[PDB]
Amino acid sequence: MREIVHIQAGQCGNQIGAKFWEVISDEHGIDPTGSYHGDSDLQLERINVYYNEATGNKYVPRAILVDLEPGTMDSVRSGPFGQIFRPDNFVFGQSGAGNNWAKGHYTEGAELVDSVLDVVRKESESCDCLQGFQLTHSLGGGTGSGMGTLLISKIREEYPDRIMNTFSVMPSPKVSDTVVEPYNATLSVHQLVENTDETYCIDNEALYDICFRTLKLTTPTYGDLNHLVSATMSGVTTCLRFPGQLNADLRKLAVNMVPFPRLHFFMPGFAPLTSRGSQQYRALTVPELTQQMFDSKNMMAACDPRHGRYLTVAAIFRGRMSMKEVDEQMLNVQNKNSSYFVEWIPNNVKTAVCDIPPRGLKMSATFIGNSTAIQELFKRISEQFTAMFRRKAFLHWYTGEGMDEMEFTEAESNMNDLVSEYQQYQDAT
Amino acid sequence: MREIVHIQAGQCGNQIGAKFWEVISDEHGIDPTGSYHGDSDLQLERINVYYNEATGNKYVPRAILVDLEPGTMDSVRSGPFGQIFRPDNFVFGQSGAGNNWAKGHYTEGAELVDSVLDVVRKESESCDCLQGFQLTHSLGGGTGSGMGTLLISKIREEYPDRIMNTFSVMPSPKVSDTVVEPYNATLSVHQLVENTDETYCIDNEALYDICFRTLKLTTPTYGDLNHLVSATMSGVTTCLRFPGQLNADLRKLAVNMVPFPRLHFFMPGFAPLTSRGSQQYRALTVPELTQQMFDSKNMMAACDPRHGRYLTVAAIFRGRMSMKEVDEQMLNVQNKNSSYFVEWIPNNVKTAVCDIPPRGLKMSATFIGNSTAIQELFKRISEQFTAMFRRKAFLHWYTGEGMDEMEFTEAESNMNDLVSEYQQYQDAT
Amino acid sequence: MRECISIHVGQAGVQIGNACWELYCLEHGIQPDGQMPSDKTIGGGDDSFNTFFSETGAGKHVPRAVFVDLEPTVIDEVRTGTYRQLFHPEQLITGKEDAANNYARGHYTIGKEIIDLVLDRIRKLADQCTGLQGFLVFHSFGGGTGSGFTSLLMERLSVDYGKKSKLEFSIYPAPQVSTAVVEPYNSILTTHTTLEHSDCAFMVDNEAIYDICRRNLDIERPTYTNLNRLISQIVSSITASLRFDGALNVDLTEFQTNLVPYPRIHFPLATYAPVISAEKAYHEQLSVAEITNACFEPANQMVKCDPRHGKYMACCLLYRGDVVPKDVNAAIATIKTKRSIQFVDWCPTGFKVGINYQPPTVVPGGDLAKVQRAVCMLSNTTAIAEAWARLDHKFDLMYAKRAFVHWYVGEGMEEGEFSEAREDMAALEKDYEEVGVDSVE
Amino acid sequence: MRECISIHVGQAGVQIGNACWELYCLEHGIQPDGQMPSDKTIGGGDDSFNTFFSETGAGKHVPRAVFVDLEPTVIDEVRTGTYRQLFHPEQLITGKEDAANNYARGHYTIGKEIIDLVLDRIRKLADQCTGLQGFLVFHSFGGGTGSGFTSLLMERLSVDYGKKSKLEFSIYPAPQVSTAVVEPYNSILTTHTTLEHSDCAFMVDNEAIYDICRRNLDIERPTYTNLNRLISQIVSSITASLRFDGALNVDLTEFQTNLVPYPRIHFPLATYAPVISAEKAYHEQLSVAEITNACFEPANQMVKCDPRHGKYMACCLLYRGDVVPKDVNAAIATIKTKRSIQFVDWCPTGFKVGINYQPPTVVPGGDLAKVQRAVCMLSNTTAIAEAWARLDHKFDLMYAKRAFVHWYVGEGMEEGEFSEAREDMAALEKDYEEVGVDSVE
Ligand SMILES: CC(=O)O[C@H]1C(=O)[C@@]2(C)[C@H]([C@H](OC(=O)c3ccccc3)[C@]3(O)C[C@H](OC(=O)[C@H](O)[C@@H](NC(=O)c4ccccc4)c4ccccc4)C(C)=C1C3(C)C)[C@]1(OC(C)=O)CO[C@@H]1C[C@@H]2O
Ligand SMILES: CC(=O)O[C@H]1C(=O)[C@@]2(C)[C@H]([C@H](OC(=O)c3ccccc3)[C@]3(O)C[C@H](OC(=O)[C@H](O)[C@@H](NC(=O)c4ccccc4)c4ccccc4)C(C)=C1C3(C)C)[C@]1(OC(C)=O)CO[C@@H]1C[C@@H]2O
Ligand SMILES: Nc1nc2c(ncn2[C@@H]2O[C@H](COP(=O)(O)OP(=O)(O)OP(=O)(O)O)[C@@H](O)[C@H]2O)c(=O)[nH]1
Ligand SMILES: Nc1nc2c(ncn2[C@@H]2O[C@H](COP(=O)(O)OP(=O)(O)OP(=O)(O)O)[C@@H](O)[C@H]2O)c(=O)[nH]1
Ligand SMILES: Nc1nc2c(ncn2[C@@H]2O[C@H](COP(=O)(O)OP(=O)(O)O)[C@@H](O)[C@H]2O)c(=O)[nH]1
Ligand SMILES: Nc1nc2c(ncn2[C@@H]2O[C@H](COP(=O)(O)OP(=O)(O)O)[C@@H](O)[C@H]2O)c(=O)[nH]1
Ligand SMILES: [Mg+2]
Ligand SMILES: [Mg+2]
């Protein structure tokens, strides 16, 4: 019951998911080969949320791996956990995407999406009662942006009542390593609007800044950035797998995080995050966890929530803690900071409290915020897009692959419209 | 009781049957010399279905081997199981067939068929109560097409109430290695219409595609293609040899697979088929076996059943499995896919469940389908035939051997007529 | 002596009889090699093995049964298996080819070749009887041997015997689940002998017993070995008062006096109320009151049916074990109180109580529990016509295009017999519309 | 026999029932595997387990309860946990997805798929009763299953039974503390069944029990396990005189005769007076006089409310233990003496005394103390309208902008039902303005 299909697409989405299937596979005691070596009986009662049981008490993840280039598939097989996945879910072409949205959404992605959805329906039709999906991808590439939003817009035509959410990486102007990333991100925010139930927007500039300032890492790699993201992805569906005092599924969050539809772009966040050495100096309590989840420098999206108002937030606590301190600290924040919360919604905060903390610490927490300050993201893209497109720069790599300009200007205008949807619900009483 | 005479004819039919008598002879524990070295007592209770017992507890197969060329006979004698057959059943001429239908059906086949039917009646008259026959042959050669259909049309004059079925290889336009194979296949589909009770149509393009995509073989040989075909041929007459929970003979299938006569062309199929390595990742259960038997890429005929409707199908399960899961999974398919089944026949599916799986795996299955989509086969031949015959190409190799054009145009028209027999029973309410 | 002859026809008929003749060997204390053990210097006929087991001299108990099949394979599981010297060798009759889902083969072509051999064996068992009660024919509607041969045999058993009761225990085709494509043609053709020659025909189907195993018994994945043990508890309770002591015993003819109104209204559905797994048999209140209510429940039926859509005409309650009759009358009067249970307006004395002392036997390896009390409820109702309308519709689809008819005509029958057996079953369905409705002036 | 059916709906409803069914197992001396120990050759029904525990034969006590949830997770703590063979397996009903804080899912989409399975189980418990008193539905206003499913069930329980009392034990949303953002939409929509179908609805909230744990009990950091043990002492005292001997016993219908004036004035708040920690239970004067005053205190309420802002209409004092009735009348007459406590001018016989002999049970691992005396005070007052005005204001803020409405409309209800349930709760709040005011000419 309540299964989750995982569709990691591209280079960035596969690197996150390969680190994601190393955290979940530690929470349930899965061996790198696939056997079970846990000690708690709760690690198997809801292991079918992610893992199909196979012959001889081996546990195969319900993950589908997509790329348009065989190289990242060869890395994941040859990594620590290449043994864990099933070899029939490594779907890949040969000709690369080009960091091009059109080449992965129209020419060479539509050729492949028949051979991917036929594998998606092998996972979904074997489940007892499927709950939803999850994409891990990257707004800014060819396969994560283009091929990811072709996969999305072909599942809502077949599974039109399941919770589909994405853990998508959005670009930032401070950290660029792709010239054409505004074209590739605007054309996929337009798809994420009409097709997705929750969208956990993540940046990379926000993830070095957590590693630099909070974690005090000296040389961060991508393995450290994906390690933060994978701690969020496990934290959201915790009450789905472990028993709690309050429970919150994927659908239960989406009911009371999303006031109006089309406003489904969330800011994730994790707590505790300390440096090594400075963990003997922090006492672990509920007022300690709450201060990290609402400080701006512990957001995995490069924004400041002081430039807006939280519509709604959610806080998922994991550990043997009380319920008064959860219900009081989540109260003492939205009265001390009542100018940073929308006042036509009383009690903007949802508390979820599980019973099982992670396997090395007590009392973790996860912050998920629906803030109006996320228009800072969509305007930094829609200023770069409208500065290139007004000169039609780098455009023949898109119009040569089947597209035309009418798809651009529509996608630019739908990005600029939802900026004026968080703007209305920020201000005006 | 319920004996089966096996008449393998030609090159292709002998290569399949030589691999076929190595699978059956493993199911019953027959030594390569012919002695018995089994361990289960069920391997001998119905061993007389295929094997005559000879002097000193040796078990000789009831197989009759026909060719018009001595070379393939020399290969089978010098193979692994040349010791198993009786040397009086190696019937062969000296002058080859020419890949010519007329030369093997009129000139040099009619000279031999007196010396073959006299051997067929030595096998049939010694049986307690014979059930039927089986040809293994090839539509596309001289001996498999021509000599095979002369043997068939002379047994229905003598054994006119026994189940005669064929395991016949049909050509495909994607894989050609014979120029005159439309002439040789159209002139024998015309014989298979009026003379056969079941016809298990097999292609070779459908058998590489199983080896390439499903089995993930790198270098397939003919020994791999015949290995698939021989797993079908054993699977159909399983309940004839081993005890079951539901039983299904050759006649019991033909009653409820064939709605109208002349519609007796079946699509075989086997499950499980995994690659090596990816068998620790698939759990073996009845919903797992059912998904392979109805996927299009596990058909041994190069067709897609989405271009038609199954009139009737059959599923023969082998193993200690339940009967609810068999009766429910065969129900959950023909309601989920009710646009792919003919709706004037309720419950298109026949379930047979034996108790004895093959000797290396539990819970195998065998899919046999009477689909209307087999008109895709007969039109791909009848377009090639009518493109050669309208210029009378390669015709003097046929009219020089006794034939005339009136045999062609009759045989072309009977092929084109049964296309309009699956077409009527596909559509129109 | 209250003797009965069991006749087991076809694959389903044999394979139920493996579950019946397992059970009576345990109820009477007979080893699989026919031997009662040496610690019984008591009344064997006082335990009354002598309705299912004729006592061969020198201590040997051979059953009053004949297993017939047209296929050699199914009865060769009984040779050897474990009951390889329980049965007499001449009462296990095999053919050489089965009827192969073809009524015309089982009734005309193949069936006449062993019908003299089957009938001659029944006379050798009919002559060993002193006080023969009737025949217990087991088969399945929707085979070839279960329908074609059984139709051939019940014609011949009506001519030779006639006055005896001939009970049938059929397996009727299920609405969604079917295993044969020609399953509806073989069920319309067996309609003629089922209403004319049998005297009380029972019907079950596999879906309605699959649901009982899954819901009342929590078996996730049943096989036919699970199901036939439930058929056998219905039979072991029905024929119980022939062979055990108890207040209010019921012979096989006291059914038909109290269950069958008119000579064509003899198709009663059975239930069996404490189908409870052994873990659920704790936390129990398995009293007379709760076990009486469960029979009238529309989910616990042995036929896919709903008796809230029709009216009951009679019931027949048969209790086993720790049962006091004043508890039964207090449980009947609650059943007559409920308005969900509609009797007809010409019944008014509702139904018949039988009670027996011998409690049910738990089969080793069984699925059931060890209960103090059990109830079989045989009950005529007008709702069994709805199972027939769901099968006429499948016959009327395939015979509209005359699909599988060419197999049947070329084996020994005519096309015109389909149009007679369709009208014949449509006349019964008109009888249940006209027997349920109360009369005014 | 004074039997009662407990119905536990949703996560809060189940998780209170873990605290209730812990307590009755200790009050009656039942081990967690349903067994009373062997040192009781006395009257069990004289200790009267038989209002909460039907005695299965061979020494086994199974509760008269059904746990329903739409989520599998919460009831699987009861399988195993410690009560894994206390409960019957068929009375622990789980769905597959929860209603997920959505009234429209719990009432229309998901709730109808198990509502037949829940109601059919209640009849199997209603038939085991001899003298059924009424239903004890536990839920929470402000879930999806606690509001949507319970509204679906109380409609169906009113049609099948009707004449029975149906008590509710709800958890109402707290004014400052809330855990759900859509918490006010699910509380206006459950208003219709709470006033129409229930006969006496109770309300508590988590803030008013957090303060009792912190102030009266000195727990610095309570969890829900601390709170639900306080809910369970209110229930264990209310239903006590059904199942223990005492002077002045009170049935569940003698509440409603003496607590409810008019058929829409049935929302009484409860208190419980000796909530005293074990260290503070020394230095005590826990007499009848001090424990009567504590119920009327506005800080010890179980609802965030102040009965000095409205007028009482009835009270209902239920005492347990070492209580002599002349001490009660001397304590009532002090309560009527005070001018802070305003009764209405049509009451004049103030309120009803019930007394019981059985003193309260100390739960091992509990927070409470071992007292000689305890008082539950059920009391109608006009001040509970003020808790409703604090929640209409939260509904009126969010529904002014039609915020979360698109989740509810796309699941099985219309936009117009918000405008009916807002008017429906505004009519009760007009009734409490018109029932409190005395009349002149
Ligand atoms: C002695 C001690 O207590 O060490 C802690 C520790 O020092 C700190 C600094 C840990 C440490 O984490 C990091 O340094 C880190 C590295 C890359 C990316 C993100 C974090 C720790 O490495 C991480 C490790 O986390 C876990 O064990 C969790 O179960 C975590 N597991 C993983 O991420 C994981 C890592 C490798 C392999 C498999 C899993 C987790 C979190 C959420 C969901 C699932 C799992 C913990 C508590 C510690 C160390 C070991 C130093 C911190 O992180 C986490 C995720 O707990 C960083 O800030 C927190 C606070 C911890 O106190
Ligand atoms: C460790 C293990 O379980 O190995 C399996 C295996 O890995 C797989 C992949 C086997 C393997 O089969 C093939 O690779 C294959 C090769 C040529 C043609 C067809 C298949 C296997 O070779 C085949 C072999 O099959 C049998 O043993 C059956 O009895 C089979 N026998 C023969 O075909 C046969 C082969 C050589 C000599 C004599 C007989 C059979 C099937 C139907 C009817 C009669 C017999 C099995 C289960 C396996 C191996 C050994 C790897 C598979 O095939 C069969 C027929 O079972 C291929 O897909 C299935 C799934 C199996 O799991
Ligand atoms: N309950 C039950 N039903 C069975 C069993 N075996 C077969 N059936 C039913 O019987 C129907 C077909 O009849 P069979 O017994 O298989 O065939 P038959 O009566 O022996 O006649 P033939 O077809 O010639 O073999 C199937 O549709 C099954 O539903 C069994 O063991 N138990
Ligand atoms: N007193 C008390 N209140 C609880 C408890 N658990 C949940 N609640 C309250 O119940 C409210 C929400 O209802 P839930 O029980 O969580 O949800 P539900 O009724 O099961 O329905 P779903 O949302 O579908 O799960 C919360 O606001 C809590 O205040 C508990 O254990 N004790
Ligand atoms: N957080 C994170 N970001 C990555 C990783 N790999 C690549 N990226 C970012 O993803 C962006 C481009 O997406 P890419 O991985 O190239 O997707 P693709 O080309 O479509 O497969 C670049 O700006 C990278 O900074 C990774 O492992 N972790
Ligand atoms: N599957 C399979 N096909 C074969 C084999 N040998 C030949 N064929 C095919 O059979 C066709 C011609 O039939 P052939 O064997 O030449 O028959 P013949 O000349 O009459 O004896 C060719 O297209 C081959 O592809 C074999 O061992 N297996
Ligand atoms: Mg048979
Ligand atoms: Mg819940």
Author numbering:
A (entry chain D), B (entry chain D): 1 to 429
C (entry chain C), D (entry chain C): 1 to 441
Sentences from the paper on this structure:
Like all kinesins, kinesin-13s posses a highly conserved ATPase motor domain that is essential for their function. To address these questions here we use cryo-electron microscopy (cryo-EM) to solve the structures of Drosophila melanogaster kinesin-13 KLP10A protein constructs in complex with curved tubulin protofilaments or bound to the microtubule lattice. We solved the structures of three complexes covering distinct nucleotide states and tubulin conformations: a complex formed by the NM construct bound to the microtubule lattice (straight tubulin) in the absence of nucleotides (NMMTapo); a complex formed by the NM construct, bound to the microtubule lattice in the presence of the non-hydrolysable ATP analog AMP-PNP (NMMTAMP-PNP); and a complex formed by the M construct, bound to curved tubulin (CT) protofilaments wrapped around microtubules in the presence of AMP-PNP (CTMMTAMP-PNP).
In contrast, in the CTMMTAMP-PNP complex the KLP10A nucleotide binding pocket adopts the “closed” configuration. The switch loops move closer to the nucleotide γ-phosphate and α-helix 4 (H4) which is part of SW2 adopts a different orientation relative to the rest of the motor domain. The closed configuration of the nucleotide binding pocket found in the CTMMTAMP-PNP complex is similar to the one found in the crystal structures of motile kinesins thought to represent the hydrolysis competent ATP bound form. The central eight stranded β-sheet, which contains the P-loop and spans several regions within the motor domain, becomes less twisted in the CTMMTAMP-PNP complex relative to the NMMTapo and NMMTAMP-PNP complexes. The differences between the curved tubulin protofilament (CTMMTAMP-PNP complex) and the microtubule lattice straight tubulin can be described to a first approximation as rigid body rotation of 12° between tubulin subunits (24° per tubulin heterodimer) and a small displacement between subunits perpendicular to the rotation plane. The higher curvature suggests that KLP10A can bend tubulin protofilaments beyond the typical tubulin curvature observed outside the microtubule lattice. A conformational change to highlight is the disruption of the binding site of the anti-cancer drug paclitaxel (Taxol®) on the β-subunit of the KLP10A bound curved tubulin. Despite all complexes being made in the presence of paclitaxel its corresponding density is absent in the curved tubulin and the binding site is partially blocked by β-tubulin residues. The KLP10A neck-linker is in a down orientation (pointing toward the microtubule minus end) in the structures where the nucleotide binding pocket is open and docks in an up orientation when the nucleotide binding pocket is closed.
